[PDB]
Write a protein that binds this ligand. Structure first.
Ligand SMILES: CC(=O)N[C@@H]1[C@@H](O)[C@@H](O)[C@@H](CO)O[C@H]1O
Ligand SMILES: CC(=O)N[C@@H]1[C@@H](O)[C@@H](O)[C@@H](CO)O[C@H]1O
Lengths: 142, 142
């Protein structure tokens, strides 16, 4: 179906049971090392703090972090690479009480314990070297 | 004026006196560390060898390299950062007899000695976190 603009910005709220679903594909082969970045921002401004930073170097590594009062905190680096060269991915990020859980094509792939309350999130940005066909934030829970 | 598609691909030939001129701007503030990549490819295929790889992490560093028979060679890393936060840039890459010379907004900023004859180049790709308004390869010289 249709392409969303990239970089993609949507105003968002998150609490426990919220799911962010992202369908997309890398713009180029893994040999050229395309990136994907998903940032959960505390304001609509791109300079705002990031509760959850998720950055894929396709075929190589994933880094997760937070930016709190303008400053990057403890990097978590993963060599877990469920993303397939040249394929569409479906990414689903669940807000559990203790952490974010990242599902890649239906497989649990990364978790990241909450450093800031998910209620602090006001915006989600999806950007770098991807096309996007689907973006959804679920709003079913009290 | 109008935006070119990014990633941007143009079939190209280079020899001594050839200039590649690129006008663009980063998609986001330097705090979010947008990238720019310019690759001079030996074929139209994106998997093809790269005679000259130029990768800016805006506000941080520049790496230059070649990919020869699929393999990255000796990285050159520069902390020279003439790019201004939130500004349009003009990038001009000249083919001199011994090297590429990179001008940023009219200032000599990087050089890269030839590892492969520039005549090997068949394609130029400009990609990552930029908008593009201008791309030109000059063809004035014998
Ligand atoms: C909560 C808060 O003010 N966060 C700010 C953020 O908005 C931005 O201005 C950043 C720039 O470095 O600095 C942070 O300290
Ligand atoms: C000259 C040549 O064949 N270069 C190839 C390149 O086209 C690509 O296939 C790459 C994939 O790793 O391998 C290189 O050795």
């Amino acid at each position: 179906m249709s392409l969303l603009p990239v970089p993609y910005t949507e105003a968002a709220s998150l609490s426990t049971g919220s799911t962010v679903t992202i369908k997309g594909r890398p713009l180029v082969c893994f040999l050229n090392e395309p990136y994907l970045q998903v940032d959960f921002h505390t304001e609509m401004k791109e300079e705002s703090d990031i509760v959850f930073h998720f950055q894929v170097c396709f075929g190589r590594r994933v880094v997760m972090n937070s930016r709190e009062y303008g400053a990057w905190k403890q990097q978590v680096e993963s060599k877990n690479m469920p993303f397939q060269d040249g394929q569409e991915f479906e990414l689903s990020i669940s807000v559990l009480p203790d952490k974010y859980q990242v599902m890649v094509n239906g497989q649990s792939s990364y978790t990241f314990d909450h450093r800031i309350k998910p209620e602090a999130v006001k915006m989600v940005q999806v950007w770098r070297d991807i096309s996007l066909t689907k973006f959804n934030v679920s709003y079913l829970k009290r």
